[PDB]
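FAQ: What does a ligand-bound record look like?

Like this one, built around 2BA:
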Amino acid sequence: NVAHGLAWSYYIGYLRLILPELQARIRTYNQHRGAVSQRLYILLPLDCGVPDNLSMADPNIRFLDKLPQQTGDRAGIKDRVYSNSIYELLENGQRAGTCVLEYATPLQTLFAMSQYSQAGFSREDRLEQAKLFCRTLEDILADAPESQNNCRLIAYQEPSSFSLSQEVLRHLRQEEKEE
Amino acid sequence: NVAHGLAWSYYIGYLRLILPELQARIRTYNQHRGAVSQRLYILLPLDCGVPDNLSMADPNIRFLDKLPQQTGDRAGIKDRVYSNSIYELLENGQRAGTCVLEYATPLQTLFAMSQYSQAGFSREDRLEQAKLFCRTLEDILADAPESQNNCRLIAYQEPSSFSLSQEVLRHLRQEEKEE
Ligand SMILES: Nc1ncnc2c1ncn2[C@@H]1O[C@@H]2COP(=O)(O)O[C@H]3[C@@H](O)[C@H](n4cnc5c(N)ncnc54)O[C@@H]3COP(=O)(O)O[C@H]2[C@H]1O
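The answer part, i.e. the structure of the complex:
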């Protein structure tokens, strides 16, 4: 049940420090083309396949720019930088949305752990732990609307023809339906 | 035993990506006063008290500068920045050493978890988990001399008159004894 600790680490050491400041950074970018959505969209692939370049996971997800970096002193590191990337979502050659998009990195940690023999984490427990991570993280944000309003969890499982851009657009449009 | 997963997360998502590049960044700073030591000194307070400003933990630990930032694309974030701070260690008004110093942030996560009721982590298990983190992390680096040569773990426990700068200097001088 390592996924439980990674979910809490994900919130304590990240979501709870950037999301209270995200709207400010979003509106700052729009001021100083297209309107960036005001939520952090977090990709939770249950197969734990976490590429580093989204464009390689789906060409329709096209990097646009970066937000204004957030900084802060943490654990003896001066000016620890929290940066986020803005992606355009394409659909049949058209820009259907623009949002701050990224994977949940701890799912990449789960994947790596399953390969290290010293970690005592079997390759078979990847899916189960990924789901415990999603469930735990969802339960955490349910008790912190400050952060829940600032992000949407996009958990998915590829069966083999899958569209990641279409998966994001579904959440991005259901959010605009209640805007 | 959440400490086990945080230790592996600490290595997979950090130590294993900066330490192979640390010497290059150290020597770059010395080129482009005093010689910075060529190891990352990581503070592991077993009481899990992890301030964000080292100078507040001990005035003899004085921030000097930052290293050249390392960057890389991780989990959909373009140019994720890994930064490190250089500290001078004072001793009776004299500069006894200079090194890249910082706390192990996951110990700060353990502390926060113990306060959240939803996390199911008792306040009493802080010390035990801190030690499991130290032990686990030490065992990981023993199997990766690439990273072990590039860092020294400084685990300590305050009894109530403690000197943190003197604690670091002891490790910094034992390393120069076999230089
Ligand atoms: N700037 C950022 N950008 C994107 N995501 C961020 C982030 N800061 C935190 N997170 C998310 O939160 C997790 C836990 O962060 P934490 O700092 O407590 O725990 C971190 C931290 O103690 C250490 N670490 C990683 N990157 C670091 C950095 N740039 N500076 C200092 N420590 C770092 O490794 C642990 C695990 O890192 P990991 O990435 O796997 O897991 C991170 C990551 O998924």
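Follow-up question: can I read anything off the structure? Yes, for example: Residues 72 and 149 of chain B are 23 Å apart (CA to CA).
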